[PDB]
């Protein structure tokens, strides 16, 4: 199990970066991924982007693909790159160690498909 905390929050003006990281407290091996997840008003908890600790395997939604990088240092980042107001969201960082027999090069890619959370942090484009 791990114990998760975002950091970077906050406000950013559009066309504009914004680096957010999340540091995991725990064991991050055995199949371990971490992931990235927002939720804008009015809209459901989506997928943003993921990584595959051992092996680097990533994948990102198609809104932000080419935008967004996903990276690891004990720690997740997610560097954010010409941000627009659409990007306003909460962002979560989760993770989950994924079953024995998963493919080491997949990730899932649903919110319930993740067993850990952060609280969520703010980031608006404004």
């Known amino acids: 199990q791990v114990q998760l905390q975002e950091s970077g929050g906050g406000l950013v003006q559009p066309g504009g970066s914004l680096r957010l990281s999340c540091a995991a407290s725990?064991?991050?091996?055995?199949?371990?991924?971490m992931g990235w997840f927002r939720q804008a008003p009015g809209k459901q908890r989506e997928f943003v982007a993921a990584?595959?600790?051992?092996?680097?395997?990533?994948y990102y939604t198609d809104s932000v693909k080419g935008r967004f990088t996903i990276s690891r240092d004990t720690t997740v980042y997610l560097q954010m790159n010409s941000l627009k107001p659409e990007d306003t969201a909460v962002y979560y960082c989760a993770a989950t160690y994924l079953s024995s027999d998963y493919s080491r090069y997949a990730l899932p890619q649903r919110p319930l498909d993740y067993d850990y959370w952060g609280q969520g942090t703010q980031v608006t484009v404004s």
């Open positions: 990584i595959r600790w051992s092996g680097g395997y990533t």
């Open positions: 725990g064991r991050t091996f055995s199949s371990y991924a």
